[PDB]
Design an enzyme around this catalytic site. Structure first.
Site, PDB file in Angstrom:
ATOM      1  N   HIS A   1      52.582  31.969  40.488  1.00  0.00           N
ATOM      2  CA  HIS A   1      52.062  31.080  41.528  1.00  0.00           C
ATOM      3  C   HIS A   1      51.196  30.016  40.899  1.00  0.00           C
ATOM      4  O   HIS A   1      50.097  30.294  40.432  1.00  0.00           O
ATOM      5  CB  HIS A   1      51.206  31.873  42.512  1.00  0.00           C
ATOM      6  CG  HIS A   1      51.942  32.960  43.196  1.00  0.00           C
ATOM      7  ND1 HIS A   1      51.322  34.080  43.719  1.00  0.00           N
ATOM      8  CD2 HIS A   1      53.268  33.101  43.449  1.00  0.00           C
ATOM      9  CE1 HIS A   1      52.242  34.859  44.259  1.00  0.00           C
ATOM     10  NE2 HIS A   1      53.429  34.303  44.078  1.00  0.00           N
TER      11      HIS A   1
ATOM     12  N   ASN B   1      47.667  39.677  39.961  1.00  0.00           N
ATOM     13  CA  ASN B   1      46.347  39.098  39.635  1.00  0.00           C
ATOM     14  C   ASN B   1      45.178  40.018  39.820  1.00  0.00           C
ATOM     15  O   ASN B   1      44.060  39.562  39.731  1.00  0.00           O
ATOM     16  CB  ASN B   1      46.059  37.832  40.455  1.00  0.00           C
ATOM     17  CG  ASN B   1      47.128  36.791  40.276  1.00  0.00           C
ATOM     18  OD1 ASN B   1      47.733  36.310  41.259  1.00  0.00           O
ATOM     19  ND2 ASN B   1      47.416  36.466  39.023  1.00  0.00           N
TER      20      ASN B   1
ATOM     21  N   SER C   1      50.138  34.885  41.284  1.00  0.00           N
ATOM     22  CA  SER C   1      51.380  35.193  40.546  1.00  0.00           C
ATOM     23  C   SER C   1      51.766  36.674  40.845  1.00  0.00           C
ATOM     24  O   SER C   1      50.855  37.526  40.983  1.00  0.00           O
ATOM     25  CB  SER C   1      51.162  34.949  39.030  1.00  0.00           C
ATOM     26  OG  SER C   1      51.131  33.538  38.676  1.00  0.00           O
ATOM     27  N   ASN C   2      53.079  36.959  40.985  1.00  0.00           N
ATOM     28  CA  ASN C   2      53.589  38.333  40.878  1.00  0.00           C
ATOM     29  C   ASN C   2      54.496  38.528  39.653  1.00  0.00           C
ATOM     30  O   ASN C   2      55.186  37.587  39.214  1.00  0.00           O
ATOM     31  CB  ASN C   2      54.318  38.797  42.141  1.00  0.00           C
ATOM     32  CG  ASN C   2      53.615  38.399  43.368  1.00  0.00           C
ATOM     33  OD1 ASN C   2      52.419  38.742  43.574  1.00  0.00           O
ATOM     34  ND2 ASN C   2      54.307  37.591  44.196  1.00  0.00           N
TER      35      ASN C   2
END
Ligand SMILES: N#C[C@@H](c1ccc(F)cc1)c1cccc(C(F)(F)F)n1
Lengths: 546, 164
Positions: free
Chosen positions: A23, A269, A1-2
């Site tokens: 994500h 993350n 993930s962002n």
């Protein structure tokens, strides 16, 4: 993930802005679904949610946008048990022999014949929770066993927590609501508001042990391997009880990292540490956050965000749509020097050609260099001491960097590794001239749609995880629900896409409409106001009751 | 009863649910969602109920790639009646209403479905759902950060034999 949240001091408008790029899988129980929920006068929120959940998990409202990423905190602990020397079904606590508990479950199984058999299965449990066996690492022998205590088992607050976040007005309110209820299971939260605040919270349900207990309660070897392991033969290694936590044994909110800024916060993350480098988050429990080297997506994003130029909506968009393979920045320059050094090694020539020709992207049109680069990197990562400049606690943003070509054995190993990578690529059935988009696809019925992006482990912010299926790489997870939110005075302006589309059903008009657009990287308005909704020429409407 | 929702869909089948309370809101959510993903949800509820092996036998996998029987044993252990009840009893009125609304609206769509957007129509596992089911889904998601990642390890945990 962002996630990036931009504050009044860095956006082009003096206002908040949020980029949500989580994500998650493209199938199954965590497949994002978009929706807009409104109870006029007291709720109005839009975003994405998970299957079965009547709340929005990632989204925005009139003055706020928030998003999540998977945190590095521990959400469970392993407990190594000391077995009663006389009975491997009993275990010692403070030298006292305790009996394991047995709970049986019964499952019906459909056999060859179409008929049902009943399978009974014993689950053993200790005061901590159930025992677990990872063969070769966490055994259950005559001397020890491992039990697992998951802190989210007793988190009954999760849905009320997201429902409460859906009702939040702004960043301060969102922070208050999260800190009071502590129902977030195992994600970071990043948010921005109209006023131009940007917030990062590592506020989730984390097992609590007072800081002085850690050194003696840890299982040191297991902890170096990343496992939150504790000594299960000592009652003083039970989770600590603190009346300020919303649940018995979890870390109180005041002890979890938070950063409230007006420039930016970001997470890909990694831990809380480098959320914004101008203000490191340090001094937390190792159950919470540790100062570990950041992965290439965080390094990439920090390379775009640091500085003093103002950040536009478009700037955040392109950080996703660029498909730039940031890991190449660390190794391709030297790798290419090695190529030139070895011109006329018949074995290496297709590789080097491909890699010199490569745009350093995971675009649909990106050349085979990405394929050669990926397999090179998989072997490169398994080598010892090949970095020119190793990781450096003091330069966390620019290290590691470069290949130590000056050291002769590393040069031989990097060369061998590129020859092996080349052989693997060349052995496989890649048509000459073929692009990344010809290989990485998502199957829709009996068609295929080329998908841009690549593995997050290579620094592609648009992280796409794929696996081998027949002749193709089949996309299984990554970029999923995208939302980029700003705040003009008219009302929240949101843009994005759901990569895999609304519906997993092949019969649906919405099985692949957004997948087609994701392929083309054509983000769309996410209509929130009654005016935007009524403007939509596809608008349809049903009222239902019973 | 007293369940009502007004649903608008904009481009790409995005629903916009408006209702006067949590029960109507959930009603519109579950109905909109079933329209697009009834079969996905039915499959995940099966998994979360530990019924994979019942409908599909021991040879297949869940969508999280666990074998059906170890997956079933894990979810049956996880979503025991007493765990579901304690969990429900800790839910606020608003969340409860959200959930009852969802179940009702999901069910309403199933009642009307003719296959236009549902491919698993007629399968025995495409069934009416209940609030417990959504709690099963919720708890499954909660433990994805914890004991969920050790589901295989839990199922494999057995005491030693005579060995040397
Ligand atoms: N944390 C957490 C998970 C979750 C667990 C239980 C639940 F009810 C809702 C979300 C989860 C899973 C997938 C995606 C996300 C999200 F936080 F939305 F990105 N959360």
């Amino acid at each position: 993930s962002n996630a990036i949240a931009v504050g009044s001091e860095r956006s082009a408008d003096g206002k908040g802005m949020l980029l949500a790029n989580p994500h998650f899988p493209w199938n199954g129980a965590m497949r994002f679904y978009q929706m807009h929920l409104t109870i006029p006068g007291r709720l109005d929120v839009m975003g994405a949610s998970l299957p079965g959940l009547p709340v929005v998990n990632i989204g925005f409202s009139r003055h706020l946008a928030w998003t999540h990423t998977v945190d590095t905190s521990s959400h469970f602990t392993l407990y190594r048990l000391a077995l009663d020397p006389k009975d491997p079904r009993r275990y010692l606590v403070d030298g006292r022999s305790l009996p394991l508990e047995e709970k049986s479950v019964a499952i019906e199984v459909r056999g060859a014949d179409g008929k049902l058999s009943r399978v009974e299965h014993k689950v053993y449990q200790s005061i901590y929770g159930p025992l677990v066996v990872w063969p070769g690492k966490l055994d259950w022998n005559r001397s020890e066993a491992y039990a697992l205590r998951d802190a989210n088992l007793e988190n009954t607050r999760v849905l009320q927590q997201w429902y409460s976040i859906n009702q939040a007005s702004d960043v301060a309110d969102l922070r208050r609501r999260v800190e009071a209820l502590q129902g977030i299971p195992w994600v970071n939260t990043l948010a921005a508001d109209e006023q131009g605040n940007a917030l990062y919270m590592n506020q989730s349900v984390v097992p609590y042990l007072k800081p002085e207990l850690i050194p003696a309660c840890a299982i040191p070897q297991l902890v170096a391997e990343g496992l939150p392991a504790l000594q299960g033969q000592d009652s003083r290694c039970a989770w600590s009880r603190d009346p300020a936590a919303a649940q018995a044994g979890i870390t109180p909110a005041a002890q979890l990292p938070v950063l409230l800024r007006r420039d930016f916060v970001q997470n890909s993350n990694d831990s809380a540490w480098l959320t914004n480098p101008a203000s490191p988050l340090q001094g937390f429990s190792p159950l919470v956050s540790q100062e570990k080297p950041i992965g290439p997506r965080a390094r990439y994003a920090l390379s775009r965000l640091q500085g003093k130029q103002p950040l536009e909506a478009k700037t955040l968009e392109e950080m996703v749509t660029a498909n730039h393979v940031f890991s190449a920045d660390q190794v391709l320059p030297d790798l290419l020097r090695l190529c030139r050094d070895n011109q006329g090694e018949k074995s290496l020539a297709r590789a080097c050609a491909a890699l010199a020709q490569w745009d350093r992207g995971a675009n649909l049109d990106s050349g085979s260099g990405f394929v050669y680069f990926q397999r090179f990197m998989q072997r490169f990562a398994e080598l010892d001491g090949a970095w020119k400049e190793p990781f450096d606690a003091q330069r966390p943003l620019d290290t590691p960097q470069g290949i130590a070509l000056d050291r002769p054995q590393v040069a031989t190993q990097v060369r061998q590794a590129l020859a092996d990578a080349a052989a693997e690529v060349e052995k496989s059935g890649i048509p000459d001239g073929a692009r990344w988009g010809d290989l990485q696809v998502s199957t829709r019925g009996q068609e295929r749609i080329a998908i841009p992006g690549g593995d997050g482990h290579f620094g592609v912010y648009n992280a796409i995880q794929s696996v081998r299926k027949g002749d193709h790489l089949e996309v299984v997870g990554g970029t999923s629900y995208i939302q980029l939110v700003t705040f003009p005075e008219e009302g929240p302006k949101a843009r994005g896409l759901l990569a895999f589309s609304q519906s997993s059903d092949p019969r649906s008009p919405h099985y692949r409409d957004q997948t087609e657009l994701f392929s083309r990287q054509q983000w769309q308005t996410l209509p929130f106001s009654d005016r935007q909704i009524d403007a939509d020429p596809q608008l349809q409407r049903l009222s239902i009751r019973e | 009863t007293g369940l009502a929702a007004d649903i608008r869909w904009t481009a790409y089948g995005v629903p916009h649910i408006r209702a006067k309370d949590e029960r109507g809101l959930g009603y519109g959510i579950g109905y909109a969602y079933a329209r697009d993903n009834a079969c996905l949800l039915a499959e995940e509820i099966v998994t979360a109920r530990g019924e994979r092996a019942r409908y599909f036998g021991s040879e297949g996998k869940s969508s999280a790639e666990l074998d059906n029987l170890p997956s079933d044993i894990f979810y049956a252990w996880l979503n025991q009646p007493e765990a579901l009840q304690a969990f429900w009893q800790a839910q606020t009125p608003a969340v409860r209403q959200l959930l009852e609304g969802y179940a009702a609206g999901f069910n309403r769509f199933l009642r009307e479905a003719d296959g236009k957007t549902t491919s698993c129509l007629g399968q025995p596992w495409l069934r009416a759902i209940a609030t417990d089911d959504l709690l099963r889904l919720t708890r499954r998601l909660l433990v994805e950060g914890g004991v969920g990642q050790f589901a295989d390890a839990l199922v494999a945990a057995a005491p030693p034999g005579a060995e040397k």
